[PDB]
RNA sequence: AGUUACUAAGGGCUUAUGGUGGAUGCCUUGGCACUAAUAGGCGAUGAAGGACGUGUUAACCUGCGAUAAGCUUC
RNA sequence: GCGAAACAGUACCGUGAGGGAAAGGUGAAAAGAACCCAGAGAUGGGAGUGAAAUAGAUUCUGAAACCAUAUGCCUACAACGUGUCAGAGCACAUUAAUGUGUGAUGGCGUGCGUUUUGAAGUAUGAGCCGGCGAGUUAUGAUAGCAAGCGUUAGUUAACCA
RNA sequence: AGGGGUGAAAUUCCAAUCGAAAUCCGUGAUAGCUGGUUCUCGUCGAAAUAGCUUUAAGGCUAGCGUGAGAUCACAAAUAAG
RNA sequence: UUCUCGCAGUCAGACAGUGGGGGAUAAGCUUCAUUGUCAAGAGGGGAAGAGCCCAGAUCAUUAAAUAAGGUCCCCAAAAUA
RNA sequence: UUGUGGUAGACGAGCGUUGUAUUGGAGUUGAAGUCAAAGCGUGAGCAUUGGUGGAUCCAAUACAAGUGAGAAUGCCGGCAUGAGUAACGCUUGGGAGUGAGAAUCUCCCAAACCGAUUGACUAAGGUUUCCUGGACCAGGGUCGUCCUUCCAGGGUUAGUC
C-alpha cells in the first residue's frame, strides 16, 4: 500500500494556480469570496 | 511482540561478559553493574588461576574468552595477564579480585559496583 | 441589555455545594453528587420526622414492658391493669422516664395493682 | 479488564499507602565522618575505610 | 523565618514527590536534607538546588542560621499540565500528560506554626466577632 | 482470659494555608446597533487586490513604491 | 459583545473549494524588588520605593472540581447509596446564637429525571466542577384581568406639526 | 469530477473511505419520534374510557382535570317505600 | 361535576372483590359495568414488597388512643390455662 | 376545617438578580466580588460581620428579561479515578574528558555486523535542518553536559549539464 499525499507542487500549481482560477465566473467569484474572507491562502503558492 | 530491540540475549550477554573481563584486565578496575561485576570477578579469578602456566595452550583457550578493547587487544592481553596479573595474585588461594557496592545511577537508579584486582 | 445572572447562579451553586460539606468521600466536593446525597438525607429526615414518633413510642412501650415482665406482669396485662382498675394518664414515655427517677416508676406500677 | 466504578481519591491515597520503599541501613565510617549505607561506599570514596573510590 | 522560594512548574512527577514529602514533613531541616538525599528517586535532583537559596538567603538577608528550621508543610500542587503525543494504534494518539507542580515549601524555625494554622482558623471568625461587636451597638 | 486502643502504614470529618482556574464582580484596548445629510464606485490615460523590495527603524505587522515605512506646489 | 478587545482571519487542516480557532487586566506614578543573596537555568528572599508587594510581575477579583497538610475527634473489626433521629468522651464560645468540630455506639437507612401500569434500579443519560444554554416577541384570532371615550357611539392609514 | 467519472466485476476505486467523497444554501425542514427545558408557595386534581382515523408511540371530540361566568337549590342529580 | 368558554390531558394503562369471557374461569396475560387502588399516596403491616390490608400524610410532635398486622426473639405490642 | 402526595391539567398570589425611571445613600471611614460564620421570613430569597478590593456599588416599587441552571446520550474556563498500572517505539559496554550533575554527550575500541550495500550520489519533496560558536531553555517517548533542538554568524557560485 502506497502512502497518500506524495507532495509535488508542480501539479498543485498547474491545478489551483491563479491563471486557472481567474478564467471563469465561478473561479473569480471564489477568489472574491476568499479576498473578502481575508484568507491567508488565495491559491496553492501560499498555503 | 515481533522484531524490536534485541536486548540482553545469551550471545550478547556472553560477548558483554568477555568485553568486561578484557576491560578489567586492561584498565585494572571497572565500574559496572553488580551482577556483571561479580561475573567479571569470577572470570578474572579463573583467568588468573589458569594463566599461571604461561603456555600456548592457555593462549588458545583464553583466545575464545577475551574481546579486544581500546587499549589492549586479545594477544596483548594474553601477555599482560600471563606476565603481571596472574603471577601477582597466585600467592593466595583465591580472592584474585574484589567487588564493592556503590550507589545508584542518575537516570535509572541502577545499583552499581566497582571491581578491582588485588591479592 | 444583557442580564448576567452569573452572580445568582454562583451564589446558589456555592450554597448547594457547601450545604453537603460534612460527609465522607467527594460528596463534600461536588454539585450533582452533593445534591443527590442531600436528596437522600432529606428523604431520610422527612421519613424520620414522622417515623421516629412511633419508633421512640414503641421504645417506651418496650422499656416499660421489660420492667413489667420483671414486675410480674406484661405490657398487655399492664394495660389490662390499666383497664380493670386505676387508669392513669401518667404516660408510657413518662412512666419510662420515671424509671430514671429514684423510686418513681415503682410507685406507679404498685398503684396499678388490681 | 477495565473498571466499572472509579476508585475513590481517598481510596487511591489508601491504595498508594504502601508503594513507598522499605527502611534503609545506617553505617558509621571511622576515618571519614559520614552516615553511609551498609556495605556501600560513602561520598568520601571509601567502603568502611578501604580507599576504593575517588573524592566524588 | 520563611525565606521561601517558589518553583513555578518544573516538569517532574508530583506523585513521586508526595511520597518523600510524607516522610520529610515534621522533621527539622538539619536532618531533612539527609533523609531527602538518600533516596533513589531522581525526581528530586531538580529540587534540592532550590532549597540552597533559602538557607543562603537566611545567611545574608536576616542573618538566620537556616538549619534550626523544620519542614512545616508541603503543597503537592498540580500546576500547568503539559501534553505530548504517544504512538498508539490506528492513530488514536494517546496523550502523555506531564503533570507539573508549583512546589513551595515552608521552613519554620520554632516547633510551632503547626498550631498557627489553627490560630488563623479561629481568627478568621474571631475577627468578624470583633468587627460585629464593634457594630453590635449600632445594629 | 472479655476490653478499647496512643497505635496509624494512612485516611475521614469543619476550617486554615498553597497550587492550574480566571468562572463570578469592576473596567476596557474593543466591537455591536442605529441617526440623516454631499453623493451613489475605480480603471487598459494602467484599476481594485496582491507578490517582491524599500526603514534616520534592527526586524516584526504594516505603509509606500526602484522617488520605494516615502514625496511635491500653495 | 464580531471569528477577531489580542500580531484577528494571525496561525492552521486538507491540494481543494471550503472550514477556521482560543485566551485581557500590576500599580497610580514602574515609583519594574536599586543594593545584597542564593541559583547551569528557573525563581524567590530580605532591605527599599511603594498606604498596602493577595500590588514584587504566580502583579485587577484570583471561585470550584482536582491537587497536599494540619487543632480536636474518630478510624486496622467492618455487610454498609456512606446518611436521618439520638447520643459517649474530648478540645472548643457566637450573626447572643434552640453552641463549634467530630460521631465511639444504637434504631432507621437500596441517586436525580424519563420510558412509563410503575425504576437504587441488575433499564437507562450522567467523573466532576464553573458559567452559558430552551417557553419570549411580531402578525390574525381566542380567552383570564384592567382602562378610555362612551351607544349612529370610537378610531386612525397615508399625510402635516 | 459528483445523485458524476469509473470499473479483468468487487460496491471495486476517486486523496488510505463511494449503491456514489468532501463541500456551499433552502434548513434550526420534518418526525403522529426519543431525550431534556434554569425560581417558589399553593385552590382542585385526572385519565389512558366510546367512536373515528392510508389509525394505535399520535391526534379529534364528550366526560374525566380545572377556573371566569349562567342556573343559586326543588337545578345537572344521587340514593331509601 | 351539565352548559358558554381556556379548555385540557387522555385516545398503551394494570390489577383486585361480584356478573364475566377469551385462557388451563393458568399467567407480574387481557376485557368491560359496580365497588377502589398505583399512576399522582406516603407511612404501619406484609422479613424487602407502587397496584393487597389498615388507611389519604400540610409542617412541627425522641404526641394519646384505635385499625390491618404483630404480640417467644431479630421485630415495637399475649400473660395464662 | 378541607385539601398543602401529586403527574397531567389548569387556577391564584409572590420572591431574588444585571441594568433603567426614580426618593436615595455609602465608600481607601473600606465599593462590588471572592473567602469564611452560631440571623430572618410561609417559600422562592433577604441576609448581617470581618480579611482578600485598592474602586464603584447597593436594595423595596415597576420595566428590557440576553434573568433563576439537573440532566437537552449539552457548551466551554481545567483536572481527577482508573495508576506509578500499559508503553517508552530496527542492539549497547568500558577507559578518559565536557560538565555542578553521564549507561545516557563526545575521542577510542569493542557489540552487532547488513554489506544488492548499517557507504556516497542527484530527482520530487525539505526550503538551512550545511558548518562554526554558545546553551540545553520548548523537545528528544529517560537523563542528556549533546542533538538533524534553539539562538547568533556565515556558506551553496556554470555559458557548457
Instruction: For residue E116, give the CATH number of its domain.
Output: 3.90.470.10
Give chain E's end-to-end CA distance (angstroms, integer): 42
The H helix count followed by the E strand count for chain D is 1, 4
Which chain B residues are within 8 Å of E16, Cβ to Cβ? Answer: none
Task: Please give the grid coordinates belonging to residue B86.
Answer: 596472574
HEC profile of E61-116 = HHCCCCCCCEEEECCCCCCCCEEEECCCHHHCCCEEEECEECCCCEEECCCCCCCH
Contacts of B114 in chain D (CB under 8 A): 41, 52-53
Q: Which three cell numbers stand for residue B73?
A: 587487544
Contact D37 E38 (CB under 8 A): yes
Q: Are residues D52 and B101, on separate chains, in Cβ contact within 8 Å?
A: no
Cell of D7: 476508585
- Looking from the CA of C18 toward its CB, the CA atoms found within 13 Å total 6
Q: Dihedral (C-alpha) C77, C80, C82, C85: value to the nearest 10 degrees?
A: -120
Calculate Rg over the CA atoms of chain D.
21
Question: Are B106 and E40 within 8 A, CB to CB?
Answer: no
Cα–Cα dist D25/C16, whole Å:
53
The three-state (H, E, C) secondary structure of chain C, written as one string: CCCCCHHHHHHHHHHHHHHCCCCCHHHHCCCHHHHHHHHHHHHHHHHHHHHHHHHHHHHHHHHHHHHHHHHCCCHHHHHHCCCCCCCCCCCHHHHHHHHHCCCCHHHHHHHCCC
Strand partners, E101: E10
Q: What angle do CA A36, A39, A41 make, to 5 degrees?
A: 135
Contacts 24+ apart (CB under 8 A), B91-99: B91/B119, B92/B119, B94/B45, B95/B45, B95/B119, B96/B41, B96/B44, B96/B45, B96/B48, B96/B49, B97/B24, B97/B40, B97/B41, B97/B44, B97/B45, B97/B48, B98/B41, B99/B34, B99/B37, B99/B38, B99/B41
The Cα–Cα gap between C39 and C35 comes to 6
How many domains does chain E fold into?
1
List, as one string, the DSSP characters of B56-115: HHHHHHHTTT----SS--HHHHHHHIIIIIHHHHTTSSS--EEEEE----TTT---EEEE
Query: Chains E/B: 3 or more C-beta pairs closer than 8 A?
Result: yes
By C-alpha distance, the chain E residue nearest B104 is: E40
- Do the Cβ atoms of D41 and B116 come within 8 Å? no
Mark yes or no for CB contact B106/E41 under 8 Å: no
Q: Is D32 helix (H, G, I), strand (E, B) or coil?
A: coil
Q: How far apart are the first and last CA of chain B?
A: 48
Helices (H) and strands (E) in chain A, counts: 3, 0
- For chain D, the 3-state helix, strand and coil shares in percent, each to the nearest 5, are 20, 15, 70
Angle (deg, nearest 10), helices C6-19 and C32-71: 30
As ranges, strand I nucleotides with an atom below 7 A of a protein CB are 42-44, 59-66, 71, 76-80
Q: What domain range includes position C100?
A: 1-114
The set of residues, in sequence order, having a beta carbon less than 8 Å from that of A41 and lying 6+ positions away, is: A34, A47
**What is the resolution of the experimental data for this entry, in Å?**
16.0
* Nucleic acid strand J within 7 Å of D43 CB: no
CA distance B82 to C48: 96
CA-derived radius of gyration, chain B: 15
Question: Is there contact between A9 and strand J, defined as CB under 7 Å from any strand atom?
Answer: yes
Q: How far is the CA of E85 from the C1' of H1 (A)?
A: 37
For the beta carbon of residue D11, count every other beta carbon within 10 angstroms: 11
> What range does the domain containing E29 cover?
4-135
Q: Are E2 and E109 in contact, with CB atoms under 8 Å apart?
A: no
Q: Residue D25 in contact with residue D4, Cβ under 8 Å?
A: no
From the candidates E13, E20, E37, E42, which should be mutated to test the interface with B, based on the most B CB atoms within 10 A? Answer: E42
Cβ(B23)–Cβ(B45) below 8 Å = no
The secondary structure of B26-64, three-state, reads: HHCCEEEEHHHHHHHHHHHHHHHHHCCCCCHHHHHHHCC
Domains identified in chain C, total number? 1
* D41/B102 touch (CB, cutoff 8 Å), yes or no: yes
Give residue limits of the domains in chain A.
1-47
Q: DSSP secondary-structure letter at A3?
A: P
Cα C50 to Cα B91, B92, C42, E30: the distances in Å are 98, 95, 13, 63
Residue B77: closest CA among B98, B53, B59: B59
Q: Neighbouring chains of D at 3+ CB pairs within 8 Å?
A: B, C, E
Verify if strand I has an atom below 7 Å from the CB of C79.
yes
Measured on CA atoms in the order E117, E122, E125, E131, is the torsion positive or negative? negative
Quote the Cα angle for B19-B24-B27, to 5°.
Answer: 110
Give contacts of E39 with chain D, Cβ < 8 Å. Answer: 21
Structural biology method used: cryo-EM
Termini Cα distance of chain D:
49
Angle between helix axes C92-100 and C32-71 (nearest 10 degrees) is: 80
Is residue A15 helix, strand or coil? helix
SS3 D15: helix
Q: How many whole angstroms separate alpha carbon B99 and alpha carbon D47? A: 11
Amino acid at each position: 500500500m502506497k502512502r497518500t499525499y506524495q507532495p509535488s507542487k508542480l501539479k498543485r500549481a498547474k491545478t489551483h494556480g491563479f491563471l486557472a482560477r481567474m478564467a471563469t465566473a465561478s473561479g473569480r467569484k471564489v477568489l472574491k469570496l476568499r479576498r473578502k474572507k481575508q484568507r491567508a491562502q488565495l491559491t496553492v503558492s501560499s498555503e | 511482540s515481533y522484531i524490536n530491540k534485541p536486548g540482553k540475549t545469551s550471545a550478547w550477554r556472553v560477548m558483554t561478559v568477555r568485553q568486561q573481563v578484557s576491560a578489567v584486565l586492561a584498565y585494572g578496575k571497572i565500574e559496572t553493574t553488580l551482577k556483571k561485576a561479580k561475573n567479571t570477578q569470577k572470570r578474572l579469578d579463573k583467568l588468573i588461576t589458569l594463566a599461571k602456566v604461561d603456555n600456548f595452550n592457555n593462549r588458545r583457550q583464553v583466545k575464545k574468552w577475551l574481546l579486544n578493547t581500546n587499549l589492549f587487544d586479545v594477544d596483548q592481553l594474553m601477555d599482560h595477564l600471563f606476565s603481571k596479573v596472574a603471577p601477582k595474585y597466585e600467592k593466595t588461594p583465591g580472592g584474585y579480585s574484589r567487588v564493592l557496592k556503590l550507589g545508584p545511577r542518575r537516570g535509572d537508579a541502577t545499583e552499581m559496583a566497582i571491581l578491582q584486582l588485588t591479592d | 441589555m444583557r442580564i448576567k445572572g452569573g452572580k445568582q447562579t454562583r451564589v446558589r451553586r456555592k450554597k448547594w455545594l457547601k450545604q453537603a460539606s460534612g460527609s465522607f468521600g467527594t460528596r463534600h466536593a461536588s454539585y450533582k453528587v452533593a445534591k443527590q446525597t442531600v436528596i437522600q438525607a432529606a428523604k431520610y429526615a422527612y421519613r424520620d420526622r414522622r417515623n421516629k414518633k412511633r419508633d421512640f413510642r414503641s421504645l417506651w412501650i418496650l422499656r416499660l414492658n421489660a420492667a413489667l415482665r420483671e414486675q410480674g406482669m406484661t405490657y398487655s396485662v399492664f394495660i389490662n391493669l390499666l383497664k380493670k382498675h386505676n387508669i392513669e394518664i401518667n404516660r408510657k414515655v413518662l412512666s419510662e422516664l420515671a424509671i430514671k427517677e429514684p423510686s418513681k416508676f415503682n410507685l406507679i406500677v404498685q398503684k396499678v395493682k388490681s | 479488564a477495565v473498571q466499572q466504578r472509579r476508585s475513590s481519591k481517598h481510596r487511591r491515597d489508601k491504595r498508594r499507602s504502601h508503594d513507598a520503599l522499605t527502611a534503609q541501613a545506617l553505617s558509621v565510617c571511622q576515618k571519614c565522618g559520614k552516615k553511609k549505607l551498609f556495605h556501600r561506599v560513602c561520598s568520601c570514596g571509601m567502603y568502611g575505610d578501604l580507599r576504593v573510590k575517588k573524592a566524588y | 523565618m520563611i525565606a521561601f522560594a517558589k518553583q513555578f512548574r518544573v516538569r517532574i512527577s508530583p506523585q513521586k514527590a508526595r511520597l518523600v514529602c510524607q516522610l520529610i514533613v515534621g522533621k527539622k531541616t538539619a536532618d531533612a536534607q539527609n533523609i531527602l538525599s538518600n533516596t533513589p528517586k531522581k525526581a528530586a535532583t531538580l529540587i534540592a538546588k532550590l532549597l540552597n537559596s533559602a538557607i543562603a538567603n537566611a545567611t545574608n538577608n536576616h542573618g538566620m542560621n537556616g538549619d534550626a528550621l523544620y519542614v512545616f508543610e508541603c503543597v503537592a500542587n498540580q500546576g500547568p499540565s503539559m501534553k505530548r503525543t504517544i504512538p498508539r494504534a490506528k492513530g488514536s494518539s494517546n496523550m502523555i500528560t506531564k503533570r507539573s507542580s508549583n512546589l513551595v515549601v515552608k521552613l519554620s524555625d520554632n516547633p510551632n506554626e503547626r498550631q498557627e494554622l489553627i490560630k488563623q482558623q479561629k481568627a478568621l471568625v474571631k475577627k468578624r466577632v470583633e468587627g460585629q461587636q464593634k457594630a453590635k451597638m449600632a445594629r
